[PDB]
Amino acid sequence: VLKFTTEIHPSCVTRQKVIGAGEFGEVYKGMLKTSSGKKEVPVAIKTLKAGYTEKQRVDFLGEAGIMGQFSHHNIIRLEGVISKYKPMMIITEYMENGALDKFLREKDGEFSVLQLVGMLRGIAAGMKYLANMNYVHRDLAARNILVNSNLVCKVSDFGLSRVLEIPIRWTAPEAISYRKFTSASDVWSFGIVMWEVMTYGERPYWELSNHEVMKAINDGFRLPTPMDCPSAIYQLMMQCWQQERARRPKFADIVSILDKLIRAPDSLKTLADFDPRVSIR
Secondary structure (H helix, E strand, O other): OOOOOOEOOHHHEEEEEEEEEOOOOEEEEEEEEEOOOOEEEEEEEEEEOOOOOHHHHHHHHHHHHHHOOOOOOOEOOEEEEEOOOOOEEEEEEOOOOOEHHHHHHHOOOOOOHHHHHHHHHHHHHHHHHHHHOOEEOOOOOHHHEEEOOOOOEEEOOOOOOEEOOOOHHHOOHHHHHHOOOOHHHHHHHHHHHHHHHHOOOOOOOOOOOHHHHHHHHHOOOOOOOOOOOEHHHHHHHHHHOOOOHHHOOOHHHHHHHHHHHHHOHHHHHOEOOOOOOOOOO
16 A cells, blocks of 8 residues: 555646756746645656656656655655656655755855754655665765755655665665665765765765775775864764674664754864865965
8 A cells, every 4th residue: 555646637737947957858846736726835847758668657657656655854745746648747845955965065164063964864864764664765865865945955866766675986885796775775875975965065085986986995995074074973974884784873873863963062063183185384
């Protein structure tokens, strides 16, 4: 008994603006009337262009079916789909500030430590929920987290998510080599997202190639501390990068730890030493 995915009638949806485009469809900002013509919500509208294959169809609608199973503050809400009419659409809640990685790059240094940790807490809460609903995301990265105008971060882009049974530099070593994707490999990816947030969207491992990232991780290298990063936050992301996946924290542990730090915020004032990459005398 999966949750009913609502089929939305096209007369209930208006597209107001074209805000992204790919080879397979576009993303629009729009409005959705509900229940019935009495409430209006702003929505994101993702289409699938004519000519789509069976695989594209199952991937596109399957992504909506996954979203439709969830009801969590930190998971993008599915309003519904249009599949009876073409082009087919996935209609979700509108996220005014877009993808988290690009947003942070355009807000470089403008947030407080407490705000950044609060973003991480919300992301972790959504991932904990996702994991305990028996899904692995497999593509967790700041670029797949959306931000609404209240600065709430929500996990999106479930196109590669799977019921339990991709950029190298976000993926756990056992998922790279053995295709063993689990909630524990999402935890590795979350540690990278932690580093992305605390650096305002720095590129993980900078100019290193994918082969070089694999060599470094394999040798025990880990991403160095971000600037002005709480020691507690860096130790936590370091634990997400344990080679042995059973030694990594669960999302349950991550949410609990972040809550304890936010509850006693002077805990965040102890900073990990930033390794000076240049010397000015």
